[PDB]
């Protein structure tokens, strides 16, 4: 019973684990999309 | 529609100034067309 528990616990935390960060990675991927639509370059075509 | 937006900035940006740069240039090639006009070397003629 023991055995069978910690693979329960095993396969759900490794799962969990890895999905969390698969989604964070493209959370932070997101982010630096919207970091990119705002930094725009602008002042320097203005300048020229 | 980031994209979108962006395609449109981009193309109109560049058009805009490209044309405005030509322009220019066309107004400045006639200002040296004025100063050419005023620039009349008439003193060596007249010292001659």
Same mark, same amino acid.
């Given at each position: #019973?023991?055995?069978? &528990?910690? !693979? &329960?616990?095993?396969? !759900? ?7 969390? =960060?698969? #989604? &964070?990675?493209? *959370?932070? *991927?997101?982010? !630096?999309? =919207? =970091?990119?639509? %705002? %930094?725009? %370059?602008?002042?320097? *075509?203005?300048?020229?």
């Amino acid at each position: #019973r023991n055995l069978a &528990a910690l !693979e &329960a616990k095993i396969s !759900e935390a490794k799962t969990k684990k890895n999905m969390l =960060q698969a #989604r &964070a990675k493209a *959370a932070k *991927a997101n982010a !630096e999309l =919207q =970091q990119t639509l %705002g %930094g725009l %370059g602008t002042s320097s *075509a203005t300048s020229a």
